[PDB]
Coordinates of N, CA and C in Angstrom, one line a residue:
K1 N 22.4 30.2 -7.1 CA 23.4 29.3 -7.5 C 23.2 27.9 -7.0
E2 N 23.8 26.9 -7.6 CA 23.6 25.6 -7.2 C 23.9 25.4 -5.7
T3 N 23.0 24.7 -5.0 CA 23.3 24.4 -3.6 C 24.4 23.4 -3.4
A4 N 24.9 23.4 -2.2 CA 26.0 22.4 -1.9 C 25.4 21.0 -2.0
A5 N 24.1 20.8 -1.5 CA 23.5 19.5 -1.6 C 23.3 19.0 -3.0
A6 N 22.9 20.0 -3.9 CA 22.7 19.7 -5.3 C 24.0 19.4 -6.0
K7 N 25.0 20.1 -5.6 CA 26.3 19.9 -6.2 C 26.8 18.4 -5.8
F8 N 26.6 18.0 -4.6 CA 26.9 16.7 -4.2 C 26.2 15.6 -5.1
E9 N 24.9 15.8 -5.3 CA 24.2 14.9 -6.1 C 24.8 14.8 -7.5
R10 N 25.1 16.0 -8.1 CA 25.6 16.0 -9.5 C 27.0 15.4 -9.5
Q11 N 27.8 15.7 -8.6 CA 29.2 15.2 -8.6 C 29.3 13.7 -8.2
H12 N 28.4 13.2 -7.3 CA 28.8 12.0 -6.7 C 27.7 10.9 -6.7
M13 N 26.5 11.2 -7.1 CA 25.4 10.2 -7.1 C 25.2 9.6 -8.5
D14 N 25.1 8.2 -8.6 CA 24.7 7.6 -9.8 C 23.8 6.4 -9.4
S15 N 22.5 6.8 -9.1 CA 21.5 5.8 -8.8 C 21.0 5.1 -10.0
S16 N 21.4 5.5 -11.2 CA 20.9 4.9 -12.4 C 21.7 3.6 -12.9
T17 N 22.8 3.3 -12.2 CA 23.5 2.2 -12.6 C 24.0 1.5 -11.3
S18 N 24.2 0.2 -11.4 CA 24.6 -0.6 -10.2 C 26.1 -0.6 -9.9
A19 N 26.8 -0.3 -10.9 CA 28.3 -0.3 -11.0 C 28.7 0.3 -12.3
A20 N 30.0 0.5 -12.4 CA 30.5 0.9 -13.7 C 30.6 -0.2 -14.7
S21 N 30.0 0.0 -15.9 CA 29.9 -1.1 -16.9 C 31.0 -1.2 -17.8
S22 N 32.0 -0.3 -17.8 CA 33.1 -0.4 -18.8 C 34.2 0.6 -18.3
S23 N 35.3 0.4 -18.9 CA 36.4 1.3 -18.6 C 36.2 2.7 -19.1
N24 N 35.2 3.0 -19.9 CA 34.8 4.4 -20.2 C 33.8 5.0 -19.3
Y25 N 33.4 4.4 -18.2 CA 32.4 4.9 -17.4 C 32.8 6.3 -16.9
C26 N 34.0 6.4 -16.3 CA 34.4 7.7 -15.8 C 34.6 8.8 -16.9
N27 N 35.2 8.4 -18.0 CA 35.3 9.4 -19.0 C 33.9 10.0 -19.4
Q28 N 32.9 9.1 -19.5 CA 31.6 9.6 -19.9 C 30.9 10.4 -18.8
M29 N 31.0 9.8 -17.6 CA 30.3 10.5 -16.5 C 30.9 11.8 -16.0
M30 N 32.3 11.8 -16.0 CA 32.9 13.1 -15.6 C 32.5 14.2 -16.6
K31 N 32.4 13.8 -17.9 CA 32.0 14.7 -18.9 C 30.5 15.1 -18.7
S32 N 29.6 14.2 -18.6 CA 28.2 14.4 -18.5 C 27.7 15.2 -17.3
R33 N 28.4 15.0 -16.2 CA 28.1 15.7 -15.0 C 28.9 17.1 -14.9
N34 N 29.5 17.5 -16.0 CA 30.2 18.8 -16.1 C 31.4 19.0 -15.2
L35 N 32.0 17.8 -14.9 CA 33.2 17.9 -14.0 C 34.5 18.1 -14.8
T36 N 34.4 18.2 -16.1 CA 35.5 18.4 -17.0 C 35.4 19.7 -17.8
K37 N 34.4 20.5 -17.5 CA 34.1 21.6 -18.4 C 35.1 22.8 -18.3
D38 N 35.5 23.1 -17.1 CA 36.5 24.2 -16.9 C 37.9 23.7 -16.8
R39 N 38.1 22.5 -16.3 CA 39.4 21.9 -16.0 C 39.1 20.4 -15.7
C40 N 40.1 19.6 -15.8 CA 39.9 18.2 -15.5 C 39.8 18.0 -14.0
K41 N 38.7 17.7 -13.4 CA 38.7 17.4 -12.0 C 39.6 16.2 -11.7
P42 N 40.6 16.2 -10.8 CA 41.6 15.2 -10.7 C 41.1 13.8 -10.3
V43 N 40.2 13.8 -9.3 CA 39.6 12.6 -8.8 C 38.2 12.8 -8.4
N44 N 37.4 11.8 -8.5 CA 36.0 11.9 -8.1 C 35.5 10.5 -7.8
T45 N 34.5 10.4 -7.0 CA 33.8 9.1 -6.7 C 32.3 9.2 -7.0
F46 N 31.8 8.2 -7.7 CA 30.4 8.1 -7.9 C 29.8 6.9 -7.0
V47 N 28.7 7.1 -6.5 CA 28.0 6.1 -5.5 C 26.8 5.6 -6.2
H48 N 26.8 4.3 -6.4 CA 25.7 3.5 -7.1 C 24.7 3.0 -6.1
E49 N 24.0 3.9 -5.5 CA 23.0 3.6 -4.4 C 21.8 4.6 -4.6
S50 N 20.7 4.3 -4.0 CA 19.6 5.3 -3.9 C 20.1 6.6 -3.2
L51 N 19.5 7.7 -3.6 CA 19.8 8.9 -2.9 C 19.4 8.8 -1.5
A52 N 18.3 8.3 -1.1 CA 17.9 8.2 0.3 C 18.9 7.4 1.1
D53 N 19.5 6.4 0.6 CA 20.4 5.6 1.3 C 21.7 6.4 1.5
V54 N 22.1 7.2 0.6 CA 23.3 8.0 0.8 C 23.0 9.2 1.8
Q55 N 21.8 9.8 1.6 CA 21.5 10.9 2.5 C 21.4 10.4 4.0
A56 N 21.0 9.1 4.1 CA 20.9 8.5 5.5 C 22.2 8.4 6.2
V57 N 23.3 8.5 5.5 CA 24.6 8.4 6.1 C 24.8 9.6 7.1
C58 N 24.1 10.7 6.8 CA 24.2 11.8 7.8 C 23.7 11.6 9.2
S59 N 23.0 10.4 9.3 CA 22.6 10.0 10.7 C 23.3 8.7 11.1
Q60 N 24.5 8.4 10.5 CA 25.3 7.2 10.8 C 26.5 7.6 11.7
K61 N 27.7 7.0 11.4 CA 28.8 7.1 12.4 C 29.5 8.4 12.2
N62 N 29.4 9.3 13.2 CA 30.2 10.6 13.1 C 31.7 10.3 13.1
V63 N 32.4 11.0 12.3 CA 33.9 11.0 12.3 C 34.3 12.3 11.7
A64 N 35.5 12.8 12.1 CA 36.0 14.0 11.6 C 36.5 13.8 10.2
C65 N 36.2 14.8 9.3 CA 36.6 14.8 8.0 C 38.1 14.9 7.9
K66 N 38.7 14.7 6.7 CA 40.1 14.9 6.4 C 40.6 16.2 6.8
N67 N 39.8 17.3 6.6 CA 40.2 18.6 6.9 C 39.9 19.0 8.3
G68 N 39.4 18.1 9.1 CA 39.2 18.3 10.5 C 37.8 18.6 10.9
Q69 N 37.0 19.0 10.0 CA 35.6 19.3 10.3 C 34.9 18.2 11.0
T70 N 33.9 18.5 11.9 CA 33.3 17.4 12.7 C 31.9 17.0 12.2
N71 N 31.5 17.6 11.0 CA 30.3 17.2 10.4 C 30.4 16.1 9.4
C72 N 31.3 15.1 9.5 CA 31.5 14.0 8.6 C 30.9 12.8 9.3
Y73 N 30.5 11.8 8.4 CA 29.8 10.6 8.8 C 30.3 9.5 7.9
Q74 N 30.5 8.3 8.5 CA 30.8 7.1 7.7 C 29.6 6.2 7.7
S75 N 29.4 5.7 6.5 CA 28.3 4.7 6.4 C 28.5 3.5 7.2
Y76 N 27.4 3.0 7.8 CA 27.5 1.7 8.5 C 27.8 0.6 7.5
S77 N 27.2 0.7 6.3 CA 27.4 -0.4 5.3 C 28.3 0.0 4.2
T78 N 28.8 -1.0 3.5 CA 29.6 -0.8 2.3 C 28.5 -0.4 1.2
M79 N 29.0 0.3 0.2 CA 28.2 0.7 -0.9 C 29.0 0.4 -2.2
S80 N 28.3 0.3 -3.3 CA 28.9 0.2 -4.6 C 29.3 1.6 -5.1
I81 N 30.6 1.7 -5.4 CA 31.2 3.0 -5.8 C 32.1 2.7 -7.0
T82 N 32.3 3.8 -7.7 CA 33.3 3.9 -8.7 C 34.2 5.0 -8.4
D83 N 35.5 4.7 -8.4 CA 36.6 5.7 -8.2 C 37.0 6.1 -9.6
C84 N 37.1 7.4 -9.8 CA 37.6 8.0 -11.1 C 38.9 8.8 -10.8
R85 N 39.9 8.6 -11.5 CA 41.0 9.5 -11.3 C 41.8 9.6 -12.6
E86 N 42.4 10.7 -12.8 CA 43.0 11.1 -14.1 C 44.0 10.1 -14.5
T87 N 44.1 9.7 -15.8 CA 45.2 9.0 -16.3 C 46.3 9.9 -16.6
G88 N 47.5 9.3 -16.8 CA 48.7 10.0 -17.2 C 48.5 10.9 -18.4
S89 N 47.7 10.4 -19.4 CA 47.5 11.1 -20.6 C 46.4 12.2 -20.6
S90 N 45.7 12.3 -19.5 CA 44.7 13.3 -19.4 C 45.2 14.7 -19.6
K91 N 44.6 15.4 -20.5 CA 45.1 16.8 -20.8 C 43.9 17.6 -21.3
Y92 N 43.5 18.6 -20.5 CA 42.3 19.4 -20.9 C 42.4 19.9 -22.3
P93 N 41.3 19.9 -23.1 CA 40.0 19.6 -22.8 C 39.6 18.1 -22.9
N94 N 40.7 17.3 -23.3 CA 40.6 15.8 -23.4 C 40.9 15.2 -22.1
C95 N 40.1 15.4 -21.1 CA 40.2 14.8 -19.8 C 40.0 13.3 -19.9
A96 N 40.7 12.5 -19.2 CA 40.8 11.1 -19.3 C 41.0 10.5 -17.9
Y97 N 40.2 9.4 -17.7 CA 40.2 8.8 -16.3 C 40.2 7.3 -16.3
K98 N 40.8 6.8 -15.3 CA 40.8 5.4 -14.9 C 39.6 5.1 -14.1
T99 N 38.8 4.1 -14.5 CA 37.6 3.7 -13.7 C 38.0 2.5 -12.9
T100 N 37.7 2.6 -11.6 CA 37.9 1.4 -10.7 C 36.6 1.2 -9.9
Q101 N 36.2 -0.1 -10.0 CA 35.0 -0.5 -9.2 C 35.4 -0.9 -7.8
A102 N 34.5 -0.6 -6.9 CA 34.8 -1.0 -5.5 C 33.5 -1.1 -4.7
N103 N 33.6 -1.8 -3.6 CA 32.5 -1.8 -2.6 C 33.1 -1.4 -1.3
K104 N 32.8 -0.2 -0.8 CA 33.5 0.5 0.3 C 32.5 1.2 1.1
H105 N 32.9 1.5 2.4 CA 32.1 2.5 3.1 C 32.4 3.8 2.6
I106 N 31.5 4.8 2.7 CA 31.7 6.2 2.3 C 31.7 7.1 3.5
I107 N 32.4 8.2 3.4 CA 32.4 9.3 4.4 C 32.0 10.5 3.7
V108 N 31.0 11.2 4.2 CA 30.4 12.4 3.6 C 30.3 13.5 4.7
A109 N 30.4 14.7 4.3 CA 30.1 15.8 5.2 C 28.7 16.3 5.0
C110 N 28.0 16.6 6.0 CA 26.6 17.0 6.0 C 26.3 18.3 6.6
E111 N 25.3 19.0 6.0 CA 24.8 20.3 6.4 C 23.4 20.5 6.1
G112 N 22.7 21.4 6.8 CA 21.4 21.9 6.5 C 20.3 21.3 7.3
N113 N 19.1 21.8 6.9 CA 17.8 21.2 7.4 C 16.9 21.0 6.2
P114 N 16.7 19.9 5.6 CA 17.2 18.6 6.0 C 18.7 18.5 6.0
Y115 N 19.2 17.6 6.9 CA 20.6 17.5 7.1 C 21.1 16.4 6.1
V116 N 21.8 16.9 5.1 CA 22.1 16.1 3.9 C 23.6 16.2 3.5
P117 N 24.1 15.3 2.6 CA 25.5 15.4 2.2 C 25.7 16.6 1.3
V118 N 26.9 17.2 1.6 CA 27.4 18.3 0.8 C 28.7 18.2 0.3
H119 N 29.4 17.1 0.7 CA 30.8 16.9 0.3 C 31.1 15.4 0.4
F120 N 31.8 14.8 -0.6 CA 32.3 13.4 -0.5 C 33.7 13.5 0.0
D121 N 33.9 12.9 1.2 CA 35.2 13.0 1.8 C 36.1 11.8 1.4
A122 N 35.6 10.6 1.4 CA 36.5 9.4 1.2 C 35.7 8.2 1.0
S123 N 36.3 7.2 0.4 CA 35.9 5.8 0.4 C 36.9 5.0 1.3
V124 N 36.4 4.2 2.2 CA 37.2 3.5 3.2 C 36.7 2.1 3.5

């Protein structure tokens, strides 16, 4: 089955664009990454950076995750991100999202050898 690292890439990485190009970015990406297939995922963030730059966060500033786990890390630098969260009209299978551009630090949880992101915790 899909690894946690691979799931993180599918859910949260978008190295192919520098930022969201339109208000339909989230609608399209949430669909394309299969985050709407079974149910409308309520909120999601995409990171517009190289994979290696995001994986490198696992050796940056340790911080406890929201859930208290101690394998979370905050990026030293801000990153281009897109916040996706459901609109009031979103109704499965017609999932619908508000796209918001931002430049924020990210917080990810890391696991494994290589030690890589497995969960997107927050934009801060």
